[PDB]
Design a protein around this motif. Sequence first.
Motif, PDB file in Angstrom:
ATOM      1  N   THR B 117       0.889  -1.249   0.012  1.00 19.34           N
ATOM      2  CA  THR B 117       0.031   0.174   0.035  1.00 19.34           C
ATOM      3  C   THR B 117       0.826   1.182   0.052  1.00 19.34           C
ATOM      4  O   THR B 117       2.080   0.940   0.351  1.00 19.34           O
ATOM      5  CB  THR B 117      -0.774   0.066   1.248  1.00 19.34           C
ATOM      6  N   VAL B 118       0.232   2.371  -0.298  1.00 20.77           N
ATOM      7  CA  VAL B 118       1.175   3.717  -0.292  1.00 20.77           C
ATOM      8  C   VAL B 118       1.456   3.724   1.025  1.00 20.77           C
ATOM      9  O   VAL B 118       2.498   4.408   1.322  1.00 20.77           O
ATOM     10  CB  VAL B 118       0.571   4.732  -0.961  1.00 20.77           C
ATOM     11  N   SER B 119       0.707   3.824   2.181  1.00 23.27           N
ATOM     12  CA  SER B 119       1.223   3.827   3.682  1.00 23.27           C
ATOM     13  C   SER B 119       2.079   3.062   3.793  1.00 23.27           C
ATOM     14  O   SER B 119       3.076   3.779   4.816  1.00 23.27           O
ATOM     15  CB  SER B 119      -0.133   3.602   4.468  1.00 23.27           C
ATOM     16  N   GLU B 120       2.134   2.062   3.444  1.00 24.66           N
ATOM     17  CA  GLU B 120       3.610   1.304   3.766  1.00 24.66           C
ATOM     18  C   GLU B 120       4.635   1.808   3.034  1.00 24.66           C
ATOM     19  O   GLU B 120       5.761   2.063   3.923  1.00 24.66           O
ATOM     20  CB  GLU B 120       3.223  -0.145   3.174  1.00 24.66           C
ATOM     21  N   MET B 122       5.411   4.864   2.439  1.00 26.86           N
ATOM     22  CA  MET B 122       5.443   5.928   3.067  1.00 26.86           C
ATOM     23  C   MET B 122       6.258   5.919   4.212  1.00 26.86           C
ATOM     24  O   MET B 122       7.218   6.585   4.569  1.00 26.86           O
ATOM     25  CB  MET B 122       4.190   7.076   3.421  1.00 26.86           C
ATOM     26  N   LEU B 123       5.783   4.756   5.050  1.00 21.04           N
ATOM     27  CA  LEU B 123       6.744   4.550   6.243  1.00 21.04           C
ATOM     28  C   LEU B 123       8.164   4.051   6.168  1.00 21.04           C
ATOM     29  O   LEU B 123       8.836   4.778   6.876  1.00 21.04           O
ATOM     30  CB  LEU B 123       5.933   2.996   6.927  1.00 21.04           C
ATOM     31  N   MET B 125       9.681   5.255   3.470  1.00 24.00           N
ATOM     32  CA  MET B 125      10.216   6.414   3.031  1.00 24.00           C
ATOM     33  C   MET B 125      10.667   7.290   4.085  1.00 24.00           C
ATOM     34  O   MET B 125      11.594   8.088   3.825  1.00 24.00           O
ATOM     35  CB  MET B 125       9.235   7.185   2.015  1.00 24.00           C
ATOM     36  N   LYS B 144      -1.141  -2.131 -13.468  1.00 22.04           N
ATOM     37  CA  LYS B 144      -1.860  -1.178 -13.188  1.00 22.04           C
ATOM     38  C   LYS B 144      -2.020  -0.665 -11.814  1.00 22.04           C
ATOM     39  O   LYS B 144      -1.773   0.443 -11.712  1.00 22.04           O
ATOM     40  CB  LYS B 144      -3.379  -1.778 -13.380  1.00 22.04           C
ATOM     41  N   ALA B 145      -1.917  -1.507 -10.760  1.00 22.14           N
ATOM     42  CA  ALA B 145      -1.825  -1.300  -9.361  1.00 22.14           C
ATOM     43  C   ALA B 145      -0.622  -0.572  -9.130  1.00 22.14           C
ATOM     44  O   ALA B 145      -0.548   0.471  -8.607  1.00 22.14           O
ATOM     45  CB  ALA B 145      -1.819  -2.498  -8.802  1.00 22.14           C
ATOM     46  N   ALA B 148      -0.538   2.925 -10.395  1.00 25.78           N
ATOM     47  CA  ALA B 148      -1.397   3.899  -9.678  1.00 25.78           C
ATOM     48  C   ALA B 148      -0.457   4.204  -8.261  1.00 25.78           C
ATOM     49  O   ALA B 148      -0.122   5.593  -8.046  1.00 25.78           O
ATOM     50  CB  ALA B 148      -2.524   3.252  -8.901  1.00 25.78           C
ATOM     51  N   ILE B 149       0.022   3.200  -7.621  1.00 27.70           N
ATOM     52  CA  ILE B 149       0.804   3.046  -6.463  1.00 27.70           C
ATOM     53  C   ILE B 149       2.062   4.143  -6.619  1.00 27.70           C
ATOM     54  O   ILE B 149       2.297   4.991  -5.791  1.00 27.70           O
ATOM     55  CB  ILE B 149       1.224   1.793  -5.784  1.00 27.70           C
ATOM     56  N   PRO B 152       2.069   9.096  -7.171  1.00 24.21           N
ATOM     57  CA  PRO B 152       2.583  10.319  -6.325  1.00 24.21           C
ATOM     58  C   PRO B 152       4.133  10.385  -5.898  1.00 24.21           C
ATOM     59  O   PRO B 152       4.784  11.312  -5.121  1.00 24.21           O
ATOM     60  CB  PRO B 152       1.968  10.009  -5.140  1.00 24.21           C
ATOM     61  N   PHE B 153       4.924   9.254  -6.549  1.00 27.96           N
ATOM     62  CA  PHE B 153       6.308   9.112  -6.034  1.00 27.96           C
ATOM     63  C   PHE B 153       7.091   8.964  -7.111  1.00 27.96           C
ATOM     64  O   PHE B 153       7.494   7.891  -7.644  1.00 27.96           O
ATOM     65  CB  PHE B 153       6.398   8.017  -5.002  1.00 27.96           C
TER      66      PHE B 153
END
Lengths: 213, 213, 213
Positions: B117-120, B122-123, B125, B144-145, B148-149, B152-153
């Motif tokens: 996940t992105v939260s993952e 981010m942590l 990061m 595709k996933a 998306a993921i 933003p990065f």
Amino acid sequence: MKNWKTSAESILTTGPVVPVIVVKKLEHAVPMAKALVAGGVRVLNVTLRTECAVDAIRAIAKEVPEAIVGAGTVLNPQQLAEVTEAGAQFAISPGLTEPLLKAATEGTIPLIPGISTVSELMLGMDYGLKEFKFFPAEANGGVKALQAIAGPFSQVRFCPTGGISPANYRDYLALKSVLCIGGSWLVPADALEAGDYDRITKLAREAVEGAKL
Amino acid sequence: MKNWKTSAESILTTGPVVPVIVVKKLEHAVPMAKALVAGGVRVLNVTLRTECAVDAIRAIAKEVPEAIVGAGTVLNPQQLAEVTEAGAQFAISPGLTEPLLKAATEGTIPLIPGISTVSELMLGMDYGLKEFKFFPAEANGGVKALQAIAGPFSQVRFCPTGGISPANYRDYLALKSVLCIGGSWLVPADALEAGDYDRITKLAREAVEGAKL
Amino acid sequence: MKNWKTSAESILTTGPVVPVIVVKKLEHAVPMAKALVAGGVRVLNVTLRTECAVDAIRAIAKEVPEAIVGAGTVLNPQQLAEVTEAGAQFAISPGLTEPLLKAATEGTIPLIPGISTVSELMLGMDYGLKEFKFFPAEANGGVKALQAIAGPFSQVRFCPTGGISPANYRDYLALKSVLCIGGSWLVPADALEAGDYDRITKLAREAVEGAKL
């Protein structure tokens, strides 16, 4: 709703669509915003993905008094500090972190952070939150997924983003747990690139109109 | 890139494929590795899923000087300590934890940890990381996933693993945000079981060859 | 298995199906339970989603000595405290949090918390856990997904919930890593609403029977 000047609820209930903006040239921010507004769309989300997102948030804050401008892709308390001082009225993040939640809870503007899993939701709920980007919506399994995800949490409300177009956005606005959605289609790069705000105003209006029944 | 002897970037850019190895018998590790190498594949990832993964990492380190050997399925700082002392040149984990990140950031070899996940993301990061296993790739929604993921990065780069075969691996190597992938097909149990390194060398070469256009 | 009066293992291996219960009226809890039991189903999971879940857990504890009653949708140590004192024999949560794990590890009853990603599993594993709700099963990618997810963790065992019906539940019970599943079909609202325990007993029996081959 904490030490926040306006509540996360209020941002998310202002309208159905929150545009997800990537502004490349500083001089476009202000008119873009006005076109948006003129087309009935008031919650502007400037993504911190460009070299001068902050400069743009800053000018939109100063010059478009009638628009509620906030910052997206906010990743850490520094960026949160930075955008709060530029005059951001709220922040959105792609996902959440213990720090970024701690810091947002401490600062002066609401943060509606992205989630994917229930463990994620729960962590943000631990800090008193109840409003969430659900992201990347589609990729995360979309509609069916968010309904499962919101099964145990009747109080929480989302704003899905990630793969949402004219084609699916009502499927989302239909759900109990969804106040609004975020998409990029109201601000296409090439319209920005080209300053054709005629077109932005209308894509917006059609978005807001197309959001009923 | 921290107090690391070699950078996570460098491991992941050495080639397109990183084999995901489950070695059951100690005596097979060394020749397996050489077959791998001989077939142009240098980043070896020995999964800590067998009774004597560490013994194997240890001998590959000692005897196959030309191979970059690391440890997979590293779950906690203990296992990280353990494999670092066996001579592991990097670690991979299936997912991340505050400890395991803290500890890796403190130790002497790069850890490329798995995310979903992105939260993952981010942590991880937050601790200065920029390289990630994306896992289990397929199951996580695949191509595709991940796009998306990675929306933003733009800085972050992945190495997908989990369900990647000759059939889909180019779809992945195609993405901006992917340096390489991990799969298990270059080291099939039955080839290991049977010592037929003739076959390992070639599955590898074909993997490296089949990775262009 | 920590300072727990009974082990998480034992709850999950008592039978194949754990009913996911939403009880609206207090007077229905007890007979519901007995109907359940009478129909061979002993692990009752009362979700903390109603105004008087706790009152119901409390009476089921007191009056249905032969049923193993626990609490679902437990979200924080407070709710954990609360339900432990009502007499809950275990808890389930939709996902996990550092606090809720810390607190459960400290209290007197096993908590089988929900996961979706491997990072999530790993965090709970850090606190010594080995048993997990996998949730929302379907939405999370279902069977294929959980197999990927359990690839690196041969020791861990799940109990999937979320979208599991007569139609797919054997696909799950088939997996090495699954001891049991959770579904809502044995306790339909309208049967509760209507006190027709005749029907609950049988939906249960058929569930337990339909769980073989």
